[PDB]
Write a protein that binds this ligand. Structure first.
Ligand SMILES: CCCCCCCCCCCCCCCCCC(=O)OC[C@H](COP(=O)([O-])OCC(O)COP(=O)([O-])OC[C@@H](COC(=O)CCCCCCCCCCCCCCCCC)OC(=O)CCCCCCCCCCCCCCCCC)OC(=O)CCCCCCCCCCCCCCCCC
Ligand code: BCL
Ligand code: BCL
Ligand SMILES: CC[C@H]1c2cc3[nH]c4c(c3C)C(=O)[C@H](C(=O)OC)c4c3nc(cc4[nH]c(cc(n2)[C@@H]1C)c(C(C)=O)c4C)[C@@H](C)[C@@H]3CCC(=O)OC/C=C(\C)CCC[C@@H](C)CCC[C@H](C)CCCC(C)C
Ligand SMILES: CC[C@H]1c2cc3[nH]c4c(c3C)C(=O)[C@H](C(=O)OC)c4c3nc(cc4[nH]c(cc(n2)[C@@H]1C)c(C(C)=O)c4C)[C@@H](C)[C@@H]3CCC(=O)OC/C=C(\C)CCC[C@H](C)CCC[C@H](C)CCCC(C)C
Ligand SMILES: COC1=C(OC)C(=O)C(C/C=C(\C)CC/C=C(\C)CC/C=C(\C)CC/C=C(\C)CC/C=C(\C)CC/C=C(\C)CC/C=C(\C)CC/C=C(\C)CC/C=C(\C)CCC=C(C)C)=C(C)C1=O
Ligand SMILES: COC1=C(OC)C(=O)C(C/C=C(\C)CC/C=C(\C)CC/C=C(\C)CC/C=C(\C)CC/C=C(\C)CC/C=C(\C)CC/C=C(\C)CC/C=C(\C)CC/C=C(\C)CCC=C(C)C)=C(C)C1=O
Ligand SMILES: COC(C)(C)C(=O)C/C=C(\C)CC/C=C(\C)CC/C=C(\C)CCCC/C(C)=C/CC[C@H](C)CC/C=C(\C)CCC=C(C)C
Ligand SMILES: CCCCCCCCCCCC[N+](C)(C)[O-]
Ligand SMILES: CCCCCCCCCCCC[N+](C)(C)[O-]
Ligand SMILES: CCCCCCCCCCCC[N+](C)(C)[O-]
Ligand SMILES: CCCCCCCCCCCC[N+](C)(C)[O-]
Ligand SMILES: [Fe+3]
Lengths: 240, 281, 302
């Protein structure tokens, strides 16, 4: 009957749909590889989808996926076993090298622009008409690392203008240079800003930005990467 | 075996239990100590379930059903064929679930991300525990739990419901449903919003978030924002399930009568209780 | 403890954003509204502006007419007494015409006519608002996802109070406007058709509802888990994969064996939610037109 028809029909629809859904999520990081980077033998039942090309705003060109994949940065890792499936140990300083939970991707060295073509993110000093409207203004508060030692002082807030959002705290270190600190990895308190991931001694290692009034996708990744990695790698210095 | 960008992430560490012992992968999958735990609990449980199936004398999945002990057994142990098997199976499920959560924690650490996912999952686990542990205890027999079978479980739902009248009147049930509906609404929108920006009209450039933000202000005069809608989603979801637990944990424990009748409180407020006319006067 | 990013710990404000202009008729957009710092702790604090236009007004006017046409009926039931009105608010009900009138538009007002008026108002209200979702997108050059997603919802509503009442031969088969009454109608609709738990569309529909919660839980917690690497900035992540997208995909690959991309995850999303009322609509449509009792149907399968 009709009902039987409809339901049998639907289970068929649903199956080609999953198939669709699945092949679309195969647009990045495919095809699969062996730990040595050579193409892996068994890529699953699903074919790579036919490529699609994105036209990036503000004349930044195009992106076609799937496409040639490459890390475009050295990886300082060495195998710890003779068969597949085991960890790869950092061969240096994982933090300094950017592997592990400290990994960063070779994104572009161009900042994200808003709908109009201006830099999406800005130090608040250069963002005409922006003020802390609620909560504790961090600016001026010392910054404490997981080792409970003071590392610097907030000397500005880098805001996201289109979303009127605090993205990073800029921090002034003992030598007078500054670093960005992701907003998402610090606790703003009444008399201090506490950073659990980094011990005071690692703030200097936080990668620097080439221009003082801009951050690029590449530098966001290298920073967030680094600060995140502290959680696993600063661990010996963290006390509470 | 690895995604084109996976290797630099596959470093040692992050394990909660047992150091480097189980710190490794099997194909795409991460094992970890709890990798093993869940496997063991999952193996055992499925076994017991098959064992129930022979005692039942059917291999047909639409028929197979593992029932809790009958009320006469209260919160004591029961013979295998008479409810023990379900009790173990329930222990094993719990073991599986919790372990699966703790593995999520272990992966979280290795990758250096937040614990929001293990977190949210614990709500699912807590809803399940409400229906097979917290409610039966409080009620006083494993027998109030739902049976493990594809349709028999739908039956428990239907019977348990109709016991208190039309269950629609359970007030926390009303609230729990509003989230389920609301969440789906919001998942519908979020998905649609991002896709429409990433896949504009033919030949146009990728829209920007500002476009997205704009699209909604134009539509319903307000845009909650990208950190927003994601905070929203997590919340509606967790809330739906939170109220779902609540509506059950109260049902049969502190309220055992017809749910519709509980509304008489409102209608019988002394200031309008006796005023004639309307529906109730 | 570590910061979780469920609530902002510092609010910042700037000049009211009047938004992108592209092809939008700017004469129609309103003025910026105030800013809720309340809202600001969760998401954006800026209210408005909003776009009026012709369809917005028609929609918005029919919308109120519907609501009010029901409202006067409730008062007429309450004996115009504000006390009764409050006491009995969820008990009042605007019911469709009796089965006697069939698909007739001639039912007396106290006997079903008023229901038709209200519905007519809702019909126009809803469709105009649909056209509104479409146009608003067109004017920004965006995909029409939202309008199509919306159409799914519309499907179930169309079926409940219009398509099914018409295929059954009478308006009496439609849903009454009322809080407790539409609950009862639902509960009763299942009883009559032999328990909707045997309607496999109903069962499918529940799977996608349950799933929507499962997914929006998964997606939300994930994006929050990696917002420490600017995860929420999904459009740029699509355009240039960040570590965020990577950690996201990998956490999931390592847990359950496969994974999404940032554009990908949102396709999972729109389809999981859209299938709820899509399947739903179908389950209800066959109910009572082709299948009288899902249990009997369940025994044979035809
Ligand atoms: C009876 C039911 C009737 C009830 C009415 C309710 C209908 C509600 C449907 C809502 C659909 C939501 C979809 C969301 C979406 O993608 O929208 C954007 C999508 C693109 O938007 P755009 O702005 O035009 O383009 C922007 C970009 O250029 C392009 O942007 P893009 O890349 O994002 O869009 C590309 C998109 C294009 O999307 C579509 O083309 C949409 C397809 C609509 C399908 C409708 C489902 C009907 C359910 C049938 C169930 C059977 C039961 C009987 O790709 C897909 O999503 C492909 C879908 C894959 C389907 C798999 C089919 C398998 C067939 C079986 C094969 C055998 C299997 C082997 C075994 O919109 C549409 O294409 C419109 C579809 C409208 C049709 C409505 C039906 C009319 C009646
Ligand atoms: C929480 C609310 C009620 C209840 C009310 C209902 C109602 C009402 C319905 C279901 C439906 C289903 N229920 Mg139930 N269900 C409950 C508790 C459970 C439990 C549990 C351990 O707590 C589980 C595992 C299930 C599982 C299921 C599926 C068989 C089915 C589709 C659900 C779905 O899409 O979810 C979304 C999740 C996903 C898409 C992720 C993938 C889920 C897959 C499908 C899981 C299948 C597991 C199953 C085959 C058993 C495996 C166990 C062993 C390892 C073999 N229910 C409680 C008692 N359930 C629907 C149905 O059609 O089944 C008859 C239906 O109509
Ligand atoms: C006793 C009750 C019966 C039963 C009878 C029914 C009936 C009858 C129906 C459902 C339906 C549904 N049931 Mg059932 N159901 C039962 C038990 C259950 C259980 C359970 C036991 O755990 C669950 C989980 C469900 C779950 C569900 C949903 C999956 C499904 C509706 C999805 C939806 O989101 O629509 C919500 C979305 C809409 C209604 C879309 C409307 C969109 C419109 C356009 C909104 C306009 C707004 C308006 C103009 C006002 C404006 C707003 C103001 C400005 C604020 N049922 C039992 C067996 N169920 C529906 C279905 O699809 O079944 C197959 C349905 O018709
Ligand atoms: C795919 C399935 C899900 C879905 C999707 C969906 N719904 C949608 C969309 C989509 C994709 C839209 O684009 C569209 C939308 O614009 O949302 C922002 C819509 C929408 N879904 C809505 C509601 C809705 N969707 C629902 C369900 C669902 N929608 C599904 C679960 C439900 C239920 C019953 O679960 C409801 C109630 C609307 C918010 C919106 C469609 C708006 C519309 O058509 O308006 C027409 C008429 C008016 C303008 C009426 C206004 C009259 C009011 C002023 C009266 C009430 C006054 C009241 C006392 C006010 C106070 C409220 C307080 C909280 C402050
Ligand atoms: C809290 C909000 C919602 C939510 C969230 C949620 N679910 C989650 C997560 C999150 C955040 C995960 O991270 C985790 C996941 O990895 O998803 C891919 C998970 C998950 N949610 C799942 C299912 C699921 N979630 C559901 C619900 C929900 N999940 C909510 C609505 C439902 C239902 C019925 O609504 C189901 C069916 C899994 C796909 C996955 C967890 C997988 C897992 O725990 O693996 C460990 C266990 C096994 C491999 C099998 C164990 C076998 C048992 C020992 C025996 C079988 C016993 C069982 C009781 C029989 C039941 C029979 C039925 C017919 C009744
Ligand atoms: C790219 O991104 C995006 C954006 O940004 C640019 C966006 O803007 C948007 C747009 C999104 C929105 C405008 C938000 C839309 C969300 C909603 C429709 C509203 C949210 C709804 C709720 C918070 C409420 C839901 C709950 C309901 C209906 C029940 C009400 C009840 C209670 C709060 C609890 C009551 C309880 C008590 C007192 C306890 C009693 C105790 C016992 C009974 C016991 C999207 C989609 C998006 O994608
Ligand atoms: C933006 O970012 C995001 C991503 O990517 C960038 C993502 O991918 C995802 C994840 C989401 C998707 C890929 C979309 C599709 C997902 C769903 C519809 C959810 C439903 C899921 C399932 C049905 C799969 C359930 C599968 C499970 C639990 C695992 C299957 C497992 C097995 C067969 C074996 C289980 C493992 C065992 C026994 C232990 C380990 C193994 C040993 C041998 C030991 C999200 C949410 C996301 O937000
Ligand atoms: C404060 O008092 C005043 C008077 C000021 C008020 O305004 C108060 C008002 C309230 C008390 C209002 C309360 C309103 C509610 C309780 C409403 C509840 C509504 C629901 C629960 C609706 C549920 C389901 C509705 C459904 C499925 C409607 C479907 C409608 C349609 C598909 C429309 C079909 C079209 C029809 C039959 C006519 C078509 C005619 C043509 C010519 C095309
Ligand atoms: C996480 C534990 C879940 C267990 C589910 C039910 C187990 C019942 C345990 C009772 C065993 C014996 N008793 C009555 C003497 O306590
Ligand atoms: C978006 C893809 C995920 C879809 C989930 C498919 C599994 C649902 C199984 C429901 C069982 C249903 N049925 C028809 C017997 O009632
Ligand atoms: C519904 C769950 C689907 C998970 C898919 C997992 C893909 C695994 C690919 C094969 C890897 C094989 N193995 C375990 C033999 O090494
Ligand atoms: C109901 C949800 C079911 C999810 C559908 C299962 C998809 C499995 C995809 C496995 C992909 C294998 N691969 C390529 C990663 O090895
Ligand atoms: Fe998202």
């Amino acid at each position: 009957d009709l009902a039987s028809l409809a339901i049998y029909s639907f289970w068929i629809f649903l199956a080609g749909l999953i198939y669709y859904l699945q092949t679309e999520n195969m647009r990045e990081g495919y095809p699969l590889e062996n730990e040595d980077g050579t193409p892996a033998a068994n890529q699953g039942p699903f074919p790579l989808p036919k490529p699609k090309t994105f036209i990036l705003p503000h004349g930044r060109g195009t992106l076609t996926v799937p496409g040639p994949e490459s890390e475009d940065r050295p990886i300082a890792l060495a195998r710890t076993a003779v068969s597949e499936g085991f960890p790869h140990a950092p061969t240096g300083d994982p933090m300094k090298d950017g592997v592990g939970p400290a990994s960063w991707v070779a994104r572009r060295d161009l900042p994200e622009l808003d709908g109009h073509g201006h830099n999406k993110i800005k130090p608040m000093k250069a963002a005409a008409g922006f003020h802390v409207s609620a909560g504790k203004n961090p600016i001026g508060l010392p910054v404490r690392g997981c080792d409970l030692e003071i590392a610097g002082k907030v000397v500005d807030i880098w805001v996201d203008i289109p979303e009127q959002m605090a993205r990073f705290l800029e921090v002034e270190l003992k030598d007078g240079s500054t670093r960005l600190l992701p907003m998402q990895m610090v606790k703003v308190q009444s008399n201090r800003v506490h950073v659990n991931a980094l011990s005071s001694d690692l703030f200097a290692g936080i990668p620097t930005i080439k221009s003082p009034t801009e951050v690029t996708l590449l530098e966001e990744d290298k920073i967030c990467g680094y600060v995140a990695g502290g959680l696993m790698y600063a661990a010996p210095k963290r006390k509470s | 075996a690895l995604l084109s960008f996976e290797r630099k992430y596959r470093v040692p560490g992050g394990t909660l239990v047992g150091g480097n012992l189980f710190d490794f992968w099997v194909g795409p999958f991460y094992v970890g100590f709890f990798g093993v735990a869940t496997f063991f609990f999952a193996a055992l449980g499925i076994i017991l379930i098959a064992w129930s199936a022979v005692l039942q004398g059917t291999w047909n999945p639409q028929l197979i059903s593992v029932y809790p002990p009958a009320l006469e057994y209260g919160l004591g142990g029961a013979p295998l064929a008479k409810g023990g098997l379900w009790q173990i199976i329930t222990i094993c499920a719990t073991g599986a679930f919790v372990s699966w959560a703790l593995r999520e924690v272990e992966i979280c650490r290795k990758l250096g991300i937040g614990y929001h996912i293990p977190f949210a999952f614990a709500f699912a686990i807590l809803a399940y525990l409400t229906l097979v542990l917290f409610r039966p205890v409080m009620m006083g027999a494993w027998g109030y739990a739902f049976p493990y079978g594809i349709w028999t479980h739908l039956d428990w739902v239907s019977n348990t419901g109709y016991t208190y009248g039309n269950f629609h009147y359970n007030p926390a049930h009303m609230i729990a449903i509003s989230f389920f509906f609301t969440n789906a609404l919001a998942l519908a929108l979020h998905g649609a919003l991002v896709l429409s920006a990433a896949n504009p009209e033919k030949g146009k450039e990728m829209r920007t978030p500002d476009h997205a933000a704009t699209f909604f202000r134009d539509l319903v005069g307000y845009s909650i924002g990208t950190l927003g809608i994601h905070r929203l989603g997590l919340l509606l979801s967790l809330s739906a399930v939170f109220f779902s637990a609540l509506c059950m944990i109260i049902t049969g424990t502190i309220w055992f009568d017809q749910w519709v009748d509980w509304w008489q409180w409102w209608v019988k407020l002394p200031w309008w209780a006796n005023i004639p006319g309307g529906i109730n006067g | 403890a570590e910061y979780q990013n469920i609530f902002s710990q510092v609010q910042v404000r700037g000049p009211a954003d009047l938004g992108m202009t592209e092809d939008v008729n700017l004469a129609n957009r309103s003025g910026v509204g105030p800013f809720s710092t309340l809202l600001g702790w969760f998401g954006n604090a800026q209210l408005g502006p909003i776009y009026l236009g012709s369809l917005g007004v028609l929609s918005l006017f029919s919308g109120l007419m519907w609501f009010f046409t029901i409202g006067i009926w409730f008062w007429y039931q309450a004996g115009w007494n504000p006390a009764v009105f409050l006491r009995d608010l969820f008990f009042f009900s605007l019911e469709p015409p009796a089965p006697e009138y069939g698909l007739s538009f001639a039912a007396p007002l106290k006997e079903g006519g008023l229901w038709l008026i209200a519905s007519f108002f809702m019909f126009v209200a809803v469709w105009s608002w649909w056209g509104r979702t479409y146009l608003r997108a067109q004017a920004l050059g965006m995909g029409k996802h939202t309008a199509w997603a919306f159409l799914s919802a519309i499907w179930l509503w169309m079926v409940l109070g219009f398509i099914r009442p018409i295929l059954m031969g009478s308006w009496s088969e439609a849903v009454p406007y009322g809080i407790f009454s539409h609950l009862d109608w639902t509960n009763n609709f299942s009883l009559v058709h032999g328990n909707l738990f045997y309607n496999p569309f109903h069962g499918l529909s529940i799977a996608f509802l349950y799933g929507s919660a499962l997914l929006f839980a998964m997606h939300g917690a994930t994006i929050l888990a990696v917002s420490r690497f600017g995860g929420e900035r999904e459009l740029e992540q699509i355009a240039d994969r960040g570590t965020a997208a990577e950690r996201a995909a990998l956490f999931w690959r390592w847990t359950m064996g496969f994974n999404a991309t940032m554009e990908g995850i949102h396709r999972w999303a729109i389809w999981m939610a859209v299938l709820v009322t899509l399947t739903g609509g179908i389950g209800i449509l066959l109910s009572g037109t082709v299948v009288d009792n899902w249990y009997v149907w369940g025994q044979n399968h035809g």
